[PDB]
Design a protein around this nucleic acid. Sequence first.
DNA 1: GTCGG
DNA 2: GCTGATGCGC
DNA 3: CCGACCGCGCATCAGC
Length: 326
Amino acid sequence: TLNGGITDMLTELANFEKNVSQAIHKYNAYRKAASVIAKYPHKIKSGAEAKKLPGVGTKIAEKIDEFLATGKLRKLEKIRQDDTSSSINFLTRVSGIGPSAARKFVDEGIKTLEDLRKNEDKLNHHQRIGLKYFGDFEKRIPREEMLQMQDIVLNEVKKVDSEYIATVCGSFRRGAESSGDMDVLLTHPSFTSESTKQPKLLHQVVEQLQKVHFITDTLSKGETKFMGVCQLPSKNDEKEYPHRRIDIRLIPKDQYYCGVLYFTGSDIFNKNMRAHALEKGFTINEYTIRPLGVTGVAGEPLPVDSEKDIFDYIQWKYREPKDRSE
DNA sequence: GTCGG
DNA sequence: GCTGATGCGC
DNA sequence: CCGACCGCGCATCAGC
Ligand SMILES: Nc1nc2c(ncn2[C@H]2C[C@H](O)[C@@H](COP(=O)(O)OP(=O)(O)[C@H](Br)P(=O)(O)O)O2)c(=O)[nH]1
Ligand SMILES: [Cl-]
Ligand SMILES: [Cl-]
Ligand SMILES: [Cl-]
Ligand SMILES: [Mg+2]
Ligand code: NA
Ligand code: NA
Ligand code: NA
C-alpha cells in the first residue's frame, strides 16, 4: 500500500482495457506496471521516478504525474461516468461473463444484477452459478478457513484412495493471510505422462466431496480439471459460511514440480517466468520445461526433480512461494 | 502500453 | 458425430 | 520502427 493510490489506478485502467476495450495487451501492460510498482520499496515522488522501473513507460509516467498532482486521473473519471463502460465492467464481475458476453448483454438491455436475475434463461450453466453466488464470490477467505478447507479436502481424498496426494496451491501456498478461492493440485500414481491406468481419478474425488456436501456446485468438469463451488460446514444455530470457488487440477504424478510451480503462481509471476524462459531458450507449461530448437520448436522434456531445477534451467536464483506474489 | 534489437 | 475457432477461466 | 506479449482445460459454437 506504499503506492496504493497508483497501483489501484493502474489496476482500474487494466480492467477497463480488458473488459471494455478488449485490448488484452494493454491490460497486461497495466498489470505489469502495477506489479513492479507494488514491489517498489519507496513512496513514489514522480512519474520520472516511476519511469525508471521496467514496465512503466512514457504514458504511465504521465498518468502517475497527474495522479500525484491531483489525486485522480481524468481518463478514469470519464470512464466511471460512462454508463456503457460501467455496465460492462460490472457484468464481467459475474463468473462466466466475460468482455464479449458483457457487451452483448448490455446490447440486449441487461445491465444490472436485477436484469440478470430476471433473465436467468439467457445465461449458460457457469454464468447461472456465478450470478447465484455473486456476493459470496466477492468475499475473501481467511487463512483460518482455508486451513479447515484443506483439512477436509485432504482427509476426504485420503478416504477415497490413500495414494492420492492433494496439495493446496494458489495464494495459500504463497502464505497469504487470505485467499480469493481454493486451488488444489491432485496426483495419483495411476496417472502419469506415460499412461492412465485408472479412469475417473478426478471424478472419484469430486464425487466424494459432493457426497459429504463440501462441493455444492460445478462450473465445469473434465478429465483433469474441475471448476466449482464449495462450502465449509457450520455448527448448530450458527450462520452458514459463504460459498467459495474451488479449482482442482489432476496432474501427471511424474510432472508434479512443473504442475505445482504453475498452480502456486502468482499468475503474473508465471507470465514473467515463462517469458524469461523463452529468452533463455526454453518453454515452460504446467507439465514440462523443454528447450527450444534453433528453429524455435520445443524439444523433449528436460529432467526435473524439484521446483528449483526449473529455476536453474533459466538461470534464476530460487524463489520461495512467499516471494512469488507479483 | 512497453520493450528489445 | 468430428474438428477447429472462440470465449472464459486458472 | 515493429513485432512480440505464457500456456492451456473446458464449454460452446460453426461448418462439415
Ligand atoms: N500461466 C498462468 N498461470 C495462471 C494464470 N492465472 C492463474 N494461473 C495460475 C497461478 C495462480 O496462482 C493459480 C490459481 O489461480 P488463481 O486465480 O486462484 O490465483 P491465486 O490463487 O494466485 C489468487 Br491471488 P486468489 O485465488 O487468492 O484470489 O493458477 C495465467 O494467466 N497464466
Ligand atoms: Cl491490445
Ligand atoms: Cl515436473
Ligand atoms: Cl508438455
Ligand atoms: Mg486461488
Ligand atoms: Na521504464
Ligand atoms: Na466474469
Ligand atoms: Na483458483
